[PDB]
Amino acid sequence: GLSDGEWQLVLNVWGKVEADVAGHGQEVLIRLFKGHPETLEKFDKFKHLKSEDEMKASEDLKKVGNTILTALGGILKKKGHHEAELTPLAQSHATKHKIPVKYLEFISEAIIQVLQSKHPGDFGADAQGAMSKALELFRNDMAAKYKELGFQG
């Protein structure tokens, strides 16, 4: 738990992503693949993208980024009561996309780096701490769902 105050700062920076989900989505995926290249491999629509310029042109990359931030936004609005939204995600990432929990941590950092790059005036010391805590809470519930699905906790 975040205090109500903290959920509020979280929802407030999230409003900036909602004004351009696909643009922030694409940037988060390019930041992720540039910082942890190995994450690239879980994505078969893109194991063939060779440069930032190919990533920037990829229509599928933009759509997947979009899909990913749309689902994150939906969890976030639940404000910690996202049990129901989380389950299907843990089911699919655990057994099908097979994503290790550390990759959830790399994506969290990429999300923060994009927020920080694109909205510095709105992403102060406050909004920063609230957003990390919200992403952290998300990581921990996922890991717990993994553990309970009998996976690599």
* Chain contacts with ligand HEM (rule: CB under 6 A): 39, 42-43, 45, 64, 67-68, 71-72, 89, 92-93, 97, 99, 103-104, 107
CB of 69 vs ligand HEM, minimal distance in Å: 8
| CA 50 to each of CA 28, 46, 103, 144: distance values in angstroms, whole numbers, following the listed order | 17, 9, 21, 35
Q: Which two tokens stand for residue 13?
A: 């920076």
Q: What is the 3-state secondary structure (H, E, C) of 75-116?
A: HHHCCCCCHHHHHHHHHHHHHCCCCCHHHHHHHHHHHHHHHH
Contact assessment for residue 2 and residue 130, using Cβ atoms and an 8 Å cutoff: yes
| CA 23 to each of CA 6, 16, 37, 121, 133: distance values in angstroms, whole numbers, following the listed order | 25, 11, 20, 19, 24
